[PDB]
Design a protein around this motif. Structure first.
Motif, mmCIF file in Angstrom:
data_model
loop_
_atom_site.group_PDB
_atom_site.id
_atom_site.type_symbol
_atom_site.label_atom_id
_atom_site.label_comp_id
_atom_site.label_asym_id
_atom_site.label_seq_id
_atom_site.Cartn_x
_atom_site.Cartn_y
_atom_site.Cartn_z
ATOM 1 N N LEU A 160 -0.918 10.530 8.187
ATOM 2 C CA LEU A 160 -0.003 11.313 7.848
ATOM 3 C C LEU A 160 1.376 10.839 7.178
ATOM 4 O O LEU A 160 1.918 11.020 5.924
ATOM 5 C CB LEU A 160 0.699 12.261 8.818
ATOM 6 N N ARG A 161 1.982 9.739 7.962
ATOM 7 C CA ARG A 161 2.998 8.841 7.314
ATOM 8 C C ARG A 161 4.096 9.565 6.771
ATOM 9 O O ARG A 161 4.388 9.381 5.603
ATOM 10 C CB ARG A 161 2.171 8.060 6.366
ATOM 11 N N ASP A 162 4.611 10.144 7.595
ATOM 12 C CA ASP A 162 6.025 11.030 7.142
ATOM 13 C C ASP A 162 7.075 10.086 7.335
ATOM 14 O O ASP A 162 6.915 8.949 8.100
ATOM 15 C CB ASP A 162 5.977 12.234 8.160
ATOM 16 N N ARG A 163 8.201 10.669 6.676
ATOM 17 C CA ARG A 163 9.573 9.698 6.776
ATOM 18 C C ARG A 163 9.268 8.277 6.123
ATOM 19 O O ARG A 163 9.890 7.440 7.047
ATOM 20 C CB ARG A 163 9.884 9.787 8.237
ATOM 21 N N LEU A 164 9.176 8.316 4.954
ATOM 22 C CA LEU A 164 9.347 7.030 4.136
ATOM 23 C C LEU A 164 10.863 6.628 4.201
ATOM 24 O O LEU A 164 11.775 7.031 4.006
ATOM 25 C CB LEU A 164 8.957 7.479 2.485
#
Length: 623
Positions: A313-317
């Motif tokens: 998902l890799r949220d919060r770049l």
């Protein structure tokens, strides 16, 4: 998010159209998902390149490389297909486009696949694979009193003939660019950090370069460790710095001075700093990683998502800034808890942009954001770094003036500024938490069980800026003892565990006015002599597994001992200063500590002496 910052959804999932060319016929075609952003500037024209996944975000599906370009800073854009796939099947694809800009040329490297339904690292062969390079010529026109840009994309050329069947033992299978944006080396060479597979299906990273404008290509002989994918590189101080993705582990970072013939892991600077998820047990990510000059200072910008949600998902770049010494969290670029894995950061005309993915339910757009706030913060930090470095370096040291105080490898500095529960890093990266502290000039005075300051090392958690101290450091401080202790009490050190019980290297003082330098797990021999009220300069160094303790510029008798068995790498929890900052620890360190410095290397004899001689001149209080 960032005040003043704004975005538009440039490559809009299920909406944006691209010129889909098949069999001599071109049609404006709606694109399901866009991923794999690469954002660049070619002679003033912005160019956004990416995957146009026509029918689904599934990696093995119909994909063309798309480009949008703008001459007006991203307010309007033209759209083309820069590279088309073979059109062999419903899953024909050109992939992981990697871009280099040289002059007016866009060099775009992509893998090419015809029919396979499985991901490339899983291939037992190369029958479905090619590796292609296309070149885009950008020309600008002023006709009519306007700026009009145009891009002519040449036909792709296969670079397969440049792939050897054998490398340093192994038999090769496939390779791809690492995605996003690569570089021109200062010597003019085109450089692609690449990801390669062998017939064991291990993956690893190499340097793939060309000395002739990309007519022929070569491979460096060296390589990352196995498991390093989607490498991203920049050139810093003559060396390539290759920042890699490692699924389920910490990002490994390598430096190479000879186009990839040798790779040394950057343990003293950036390797192992970035974790792919709060627990560092989740898939990793592609990352933007560039070297730029903002307000006259060469820096590095790096992005990576925090991945609180886990899996892919890799949220919060997140965006970081570093001078290869200090590492600062600019902050979250993406919005709220939106999924946002792949990013490209462009700094053009003193404006900062980011092209990035947003993912809802496996449907991907790329937003094009104006990082107004982030740049502002970046410029503040840079100014504090430049100011404290200047301050230190301009001190006339006791001889005219003796040697300058060193800022080379100076990472942190705890001096005057503090709040009720923190001692503030002048370089604004990492603060130390405090208990039982009373502020005094350029430092803190500590008392009572539980007193001290704690400067987190592994405790930084996901992102561990001080991971170099496991390999080499110098910790410096001025200390004053106000009361003979009941028994051995701590002043300063590096803790291997949370309590401070197990110490890598440290200094204590005891009831008989002796110092108690602690070398690893070695038994302690009390030595030297100290007086109450007197201010002492303490220096602790560790390098090549050996720790030394200096007082007033001279090594304590017996210093220079092994502190790290040779079987392992230390995992320092934190540095403790002026007590343990633990209620559970019975000691009562009643002491004043001023001007704590932390370097990422072992200072030399003169550098140590210069610091001892300048104690009273380094404080931030006055400036």
């Amino acid at each position: 998010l960032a005040p003043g910052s704004s975005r538009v959804e440039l490559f809009k999932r299920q909406s944006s159209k691209v010129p889909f060319e098949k069999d001599g016929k071109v049609t404006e075609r709606v694109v399901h998902s866009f991923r794999l952003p690469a954002l660049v500037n070619v002679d003033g024209v912005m160019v956004a390149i990416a995957d146009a996944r026509y029918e689904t975000s599934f990696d093995n599906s119909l994909i063309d490389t798309v480009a949008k370009y703008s001459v007006d800073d991203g307010e309007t854009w033209e759209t083309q297909i820069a590279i088309k796939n073979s059109r062999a099947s419903s899953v024909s694809r050109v992939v992981d486009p990697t871009v280099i800009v040289k002059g007016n040329k866009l060099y775009v490297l992509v893998g090419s696949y015809n029919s396979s339904r499985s991901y490339w690292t899983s291939h037992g062969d190369a029958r479905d694979w090619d590796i292609l390079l296309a070149v885009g010529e950008v020309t600008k026109s002023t006709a009519g009193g306007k700026i009009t840009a145009s891009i002519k994309w040449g036909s792709p050329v296969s670079l397969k003939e440049f792939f050897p069947a054998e490398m340093e033992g192994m038999h090769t299978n496939q390779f791809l660019g690492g995605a996003g944006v690569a570089i021109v080396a200062s010597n003019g060479n085109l450089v692609y950090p690449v990801q390669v597979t062998n017939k064991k299906k291990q993956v690893f990273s190499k340097i793939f370069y060309s000395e002739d404008e990309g007519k022929t290509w070569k491979f460096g002989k060296g390589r990352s460790a196995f498991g390093c994918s989607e490498p991203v590189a920049l050139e810093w101080e003559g060396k390539l710095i290759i920042n890699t993705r490692v699924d389920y582990r910490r990002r490994l970072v390598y430096e190479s001075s000879d186009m990839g013939n040798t790779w040394l892991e950057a343990v003293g600077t950036l390797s192992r700093v970035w974790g792919p998820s709060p627990k560092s047990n989740q898939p990793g990510s592609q990352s933007s990683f560039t070297a730029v000059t903002i307000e006259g200072m060469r820096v590095m910008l790096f992005t990576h998502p925090l991945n609180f949600k886990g899996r892919w998902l890799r949220d919060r770049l997140n965006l970081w800034l570093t001078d290869n010494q200090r590492i600062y969290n600019v902050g979250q670029v993406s919005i709220g808890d939106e999924n946002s894995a792949y990013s490209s950061v462009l700094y053009k005309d003193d404006k900062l942009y980011c092209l990035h993915e947003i993912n809802s339910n496996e449907v991907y757009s790329l937003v094009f954001a104006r990082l107004v706030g982030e740049l502002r913060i970046i410029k503040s930090v840079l100014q504090s770094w430049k100011n404290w470095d200047s301050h230190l370096s301009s001190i006339c040291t006791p001889a005219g003036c003796g040697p300058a105080v060193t800022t080379v490898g100076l990472v942190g500095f705890l001096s005057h500024s503090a709040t009720k529960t923190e001692w503030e890093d002048a370089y604004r990266c990492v603060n130390a938490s405090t208990a039982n502290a009373e502020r005094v000039p350029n430092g803190l005075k500590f008392a009572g069980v539980g007193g001290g300051a704690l400067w987190p090392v592994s405790q930084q958690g996901q992102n561990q800026r001080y991971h170099f101290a496991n390999h080499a450091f110098t910790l410096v401080a001025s200390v004053t003892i106000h009361e003979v202790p009941k028994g051995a009490s701590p002043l300063l050190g590096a803790s291997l565990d949370s309590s401070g019980g197990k110490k890598l290297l440290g200094l204590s003082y005891d009831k008989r006015h002796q110092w108690q330098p602690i070398y690893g797990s070695t038994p302690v021999t009390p030595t030297g002599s100290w007086e109450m009220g007197k201010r002492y300069h303490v220096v602790l160094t560790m390098a090549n597994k050996i720790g030394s303790v200096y007082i007033d510029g001279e090594p304590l008798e017996g210093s220079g001992q092994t502190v790290v068995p040779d079987e392992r790498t230390p995992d320092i929890s934190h540095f403790y200063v002026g007590g343990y900052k633990r209620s559970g620890m019975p000691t009562d360190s009643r002491v004043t500590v001023n001007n704590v410095l932390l370097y990422n290397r072992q200072l030399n004899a003169e550098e140590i002496r210069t610091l001892f001689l300048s104690q009273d001149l380094i404080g931030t209080e006055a400036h």
